[PDB]
Ligand binder design. Structure first.
Ligand SMILES: Cc1cc2nc3c(=O)[nH]c(=O)nc-3n(C[C@H](O)[C@H](O)[C@H](O)COP(=O)(O)OP(=O)(O)OC[C@H]3O[C@@H](n4cnc5c(N)ncnc54)[C@H](O)[C@@H]3O)c2cc1C
Length: 479
């Protein structure tokens, strides 16, 4: 196509949400998604979670996973039949959504409302969304290593990485994960379970004192490290990689403190950089504090260019300028971007949530500014039988926790197995709650949103914690 009315760059979560938002507000709209990957839009969270807890050899082909409750779901947002071909898109009655797979936008000419693809073709647009997501960080130690080291290092991001790494876990004796964050720890538990059944080894190493140690308070970071160790994973905290080489066919990791780790394959999960390469020819601002395209309240980066998802550095209604790596944010900001591309002129006021499941038994949710260097008030309780991701998925029918929590924010609230197993952690700044972590507490994110939006100087967080830990039959009106 040489001209399209709506052009979405990137075919991930934010792009799909915007495409559907445009079609709802502008029925008959013609929307083209350009996607460098071969697959139609799909969600990422199952790649590190339910797709590993199957023992079904066919999921690498069907990309249908069993949710924790046993209900199957496609990783794809919509089947192919939902889309029209790019060739038909200009002509077909009542418009549609087409995806040009296997094509990368390599240049964006803001001034001329035009993109250029890797195959040399050019497309002009009336409205454009940048939904390019991010690019995984590597380690300099792996960068300096040889081609073989790099060929045996997985930056875990996409379906292709699930497929290749799942095969490796069936075939090798030792896999090492570098990175202690949520994704690394999800993979550690996933691989850990596979290795326990096979008799093989999984190592996880990171520089913090314990898993998710930059986010969780020390008590709960250490508990998480022991949970991962009970899955059979050798967890090595306080580990700084100095070099990686090959010796006798195996990868040899040398840590700064002198320890060595011999392993067969490496998975690095040490974060990402927003993909801002299309800023290179001008017209688009970038953020240096956090990364990403700087956008205004309506998610605009230029007169007819919007940005959504991981690539956007947006103005958080509570926290100011920030970027997130949240499925929830990609969905909500993508939808809003699509609305503003059809003239809604609405600000992005959503408080994005995050969640991580380490398995059916352990999950976390996070909202706002969740930094372990802030003072935290943790209020903990014994877990009941329903305080785990599997029960939450059984109650709601989805494992996509932003869907079971919903995007909404509570408006009014009415109040009519050997130690701690859940709790709420309040992150304080200026005597105010600026972030919350929920540990095995589900269906209360709307309440966490309300507490953070109120921003009052709370005494008796002992009492507020009861809204998360204790009260069951709360009657709440959501918005
Ligand atoms: C393994 C994994 C597990 C996750 N688990 C969770 C979880 O449990 N909870 C949670 O809240 N979040 C989770 N996340 C984060 C969440 O998936 C992301 O926030 C979400 O994918 C962001 O969507 P996006 O559309 O902004 O970016 P993406 O979904 O990455 O989409 C970007 C797409 O655009 C393509 N692209 C980039 N540049 C170009 C270009 N120039 N031309 C064409 N195409 C281009 C990319 O190849 C990619 O397909 C997880 C992420 C990963 C990788």
């Amino acid at each position: 196509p040489s001209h399209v009315p709506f052009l979405l760059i990137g075919g991930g979560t934010a792009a799909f949400a915007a495409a559907r938002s445009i079609r709802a507000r502008d029925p008959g709209a013609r929307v083209l998604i350009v996607s460098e990957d071969p697959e139609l839009p799909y969600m990422r969270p199952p790649l590190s979670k339910e797709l590993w807890f199957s023992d079904d050899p066919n999921v690498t082909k069907t990309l249908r996973f069993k949710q924790w409750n046993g209900k199957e779901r496609s990783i794809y947002f919509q089947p192919p039949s939902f889309y029209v071909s790019a060739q038909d898109l200009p002509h077909i009655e009542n418009g549609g959504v087409a995806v040009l797979t296997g094509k990368k936008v390599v240049q964006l000419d803001v001034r001329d409302n035009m993109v250029k693809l890797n195959d040399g073709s050019q497309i002009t647009y009336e409205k454009c969304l940048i939904a390019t997501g991010g690019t995984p960080r590597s380690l300099s130690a792996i960068d300096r290593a040889g081609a073989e080291v790099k060929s045996r290092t997985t930056l875990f991001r996409k379906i292709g990485d699930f497929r290749s790494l799942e095969k490796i876990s069936r075939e090798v004796k030792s896999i090492t994960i570098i990175g202690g964050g949520f994704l690394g720890s999800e993979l550690a538990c996933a691989l850990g379970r596979k290795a326990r059944a096979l008799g093989t080894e999984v190592i996880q190493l990171f520089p913090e004192k314990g898993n998710m140690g930059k986010i969780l308070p020390e008590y709960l970071s250490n508990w998480t490290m022991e949970k991962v160790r009970r899955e059979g994973v050798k967890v090595m905290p306080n580990a700084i990689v100095q070099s990686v080489g090959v010796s006798s066919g195996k990868l040899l990791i040398k840590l700064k403190d002198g320890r060595k780790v011999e392993t067969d394959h490496i998975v690095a999960a040490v974060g990402l950089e927003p993909n801002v390469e299309l800023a290179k020819t001008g017209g688009l601002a970038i953020d240096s504090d956090f990364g990403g395209f700087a956008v205004n309240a309506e998610l605009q980066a230029a007169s007819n260019i919007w940005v959504a998802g991981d690539a956007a550095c947006f103005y958080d209604i509570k926290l100011g300028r920030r970027r997130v790596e949240h499925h929830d944010h990609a969905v909500v900001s993508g939808r809003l971007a699509g609305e503003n591309m059809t003239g809604a002129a609405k600000p992005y006021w959503h408080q994005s949530m995050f969640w991580s499941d380490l398995g059916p038994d352990v999950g976390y949710e996070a909202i706002g500014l969740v930094d372990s260097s802030l003072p935290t008030v943790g209020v903990f309780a014994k877990a009941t039988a329903q305080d785990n991701p599997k029960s939450a998925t059984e109650q709601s029918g989805t494992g996509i926790r932003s869907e079971s929590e919903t995007e909404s924010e509570a408006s009014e609230i009415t109040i009519p197995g050997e130690d701690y197993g859940k709790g709420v952690i309040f992150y304080l700044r200026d005597k105010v709650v600026v972030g919350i972590v929920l540990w095995n507490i589900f269906n209360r994110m709307p309440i966490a949103r309300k507490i953070i939006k109120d921003g009052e100087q709370h005494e008796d967080l002992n009492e507020v914690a009861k809204l998360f830990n204790i009260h069951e039959d709360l009657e709440v009106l959501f918005q």
